[PDB]
Design a protein around this ligand. Structure first.
Ligand SMILES: Nc1ncnc2c1ncn2[C@@H]1O[C@H](COP(=O)(O)OP(=O)(O)O)[C@@H](O)[C@H]1O
Ligand SMILES: [Mg+2]
Ligand SMILES: [Mg+2]
Ligand SMILES: [Mg+2]
Length: 312
């Protein structure tokens, strides 16, 4: 026992891996090195284009990284579509994902699906969204398709939620931000603490005070409706990704923290918005969280001398 693991940091802008590098030395079993020192057990790397090529080569050196190469395939708005449209065991069972299309600055099935709604009298309000980049919430197809060419960024038109479930007082809108960790073995872990971001119609609601509104103002509960469904979309998007990201054969390990973003309507339904690959958190959590990313994700590979997570 009593080993001394190494590690480097190639992303300092990251507040989440800034807090871990702190808890890391917080056990004196670790030691940071130079940004370009190959001799590492762990690498807290950059948000974009991480050099997964120089990993696994050092002999007798096992390396864990905080990103799963290719999980951008779930974090790219665009790619998020291609992925669900492709996936057979999903495209059918997919009722929680706004019909979206990627217009090449497709666009065909767009209008074709736009008319069918204009000709059946019903909501026909969409929203234009950028890949990694501006947005627009229109109803005139052409007033959009002719607006994604002025951007030249390849966007995605998505069904806008006309009937959102609001909050009282203030009668404001909101979205929930989950937090999922996936270690080297591939065990999903949902951090019990989520967070609501709201506006005027903003604050920051927490699962405790939020579950309040869902009963003493409403007729239901936080897990008897929402959590049940969230714990599914998540489980499904990841299980559909497992094949293209499994490091089961590469010469190194990797884990990652994802940030799911959902929306609920008056019908009480839950929809998925986006998934974040390098999501940050809330200042009242950076502590209880970052400790998990080391308890569950890190020390699971590199041992040490010696209720917050759900495994889907
Ligand atoms: N499909 C949608 N329907 C209704 N509202 C949406 C939809 N997608 C996103 N939103 C709203 O947009 C907000 C998020 O904007 P955001 O994604 O943070 O812009 P950006 O991606 O540039 O940071 C959320 O609060 C949510 O209410
Ligand atoms: Mg990887
Ligand atoms: Mg990560
Ligand atoms: Mg192991």
């Amino acid at each position: 026992g009593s080993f001394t693991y190494t590690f480097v940091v190639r992303d300092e802008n990251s507040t989440v891996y800034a807090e871990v590098a702190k808890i890391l030395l917080a056990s004196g079993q670790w030691k940071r090195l130079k940004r370009d020192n190959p001799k590492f057990n762990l690498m807290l790397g950059e948000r974009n284009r991480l050099p997964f090529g120089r990993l696994g080569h050092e002999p007798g050196l096992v390396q864990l990284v905080n990103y799963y190469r290719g999980a951008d395939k779930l974090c790219r708005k665009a790619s998020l579509v291609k992925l669900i449209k492709t996936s057979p065991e999903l495209t059918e069972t997919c009722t929680w994902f706004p019909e979206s299309y990627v217009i090449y600055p497709e666009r065909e099935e767009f209008r074709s699906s736009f008319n069918k709604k204009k000709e059946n009298e019903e909501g026909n309000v969409w929203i234009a969204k950028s890949s990694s980049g501006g947005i627009l919430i229109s109803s005139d197809a052409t007033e959009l398709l002719d607006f994604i060419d002025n951007q030249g960024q390849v966007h995605v038109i998505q069904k806008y939620l006309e009937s959102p479930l609001l909050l009282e007082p203030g009668h404001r809108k909101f979205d929930i931000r989950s937090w999922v960790l996936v270690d080297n073995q591939y065990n999903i872990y949902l951090y019990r603490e989520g967070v609501l971001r709201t506006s005027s119609e903003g604050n920051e609601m927490f699962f405790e005070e939020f579950n309040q509104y869902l009963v003493t103002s409403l007729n239901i509960n936080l897990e008897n409706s929402i959590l049940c469904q969230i714990k599914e979309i998540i489980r499904v998007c990841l299980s559909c990704l497992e094949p293209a990201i499994s490091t089961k054969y590469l010469p190194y390990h990797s884990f990652q923290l994802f940030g799911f973003d959902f929306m609920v309507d008056k019908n009480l339904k839950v929809w998925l918005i986006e998934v974040n690959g390098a999501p940050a958190c809330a200042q009242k959590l950076y502590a209880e969280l970052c400790k998990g990313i080391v308890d569950l994700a890190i020390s699971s590979v590199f041992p040490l001398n010696e209720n917050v997570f759900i495994k889907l």
